[PDB]
């Protein structure tokens, strides 16, 4: 008279299938990308242009000597 099945206490667990979490898609991407990339080239032309100014100063000390 000592046998298994309980009178109660059950679930069940699902048979389902779901993890579609979105996700920042669909014109949200391709907009943060271009907005990041244009910040890069804007951070250029303030350094590459400025280094060309110091470049001419480096040639300047050459030319003020050599006679």
């Amino acid at each position: 008279k000592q046998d298994m099945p309980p009178v109660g206490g059950y679930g069940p667990i699902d048979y389902k299938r779901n993890l579609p979490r979105r996700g920042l898609s669909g014109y949200s991407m391709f907009a943060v990308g271009i907005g990041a990339l244009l910040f890069g080239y804007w951070s250029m032309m303030k350094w590459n242009r400025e280094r060309r100014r110091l470049q001419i100063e480096d040639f300047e000390a050459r030319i003020a000597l050599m006679p």
Partner: protein, 54 residues
């Protein structure tokens, strides 16, 4: 060819290093302007740096 003597050499030579020569170097050339720019005409406009020693 004929060369000048061992004299008209051995002048008071500026014995400094490279960085201390490049230290001022900027104030230097832009305010003397009489002996050096004319020396370029003494070298470019006529060649043979054996004539041009003054």
């Amino acid at each position: 060819v004929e060369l000048p003597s061992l004299e008209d050499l051995k002048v008071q030579e500026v014995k400094v290093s490279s960085s201390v020569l490049k230290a001022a170097a900027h104030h230097y050339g832009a305010q003397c302007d009489k002996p050096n720019k004319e020396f370029m005409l003494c070298r470019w406009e006529e060649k043979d740096p054996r004539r041009c020693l003054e």
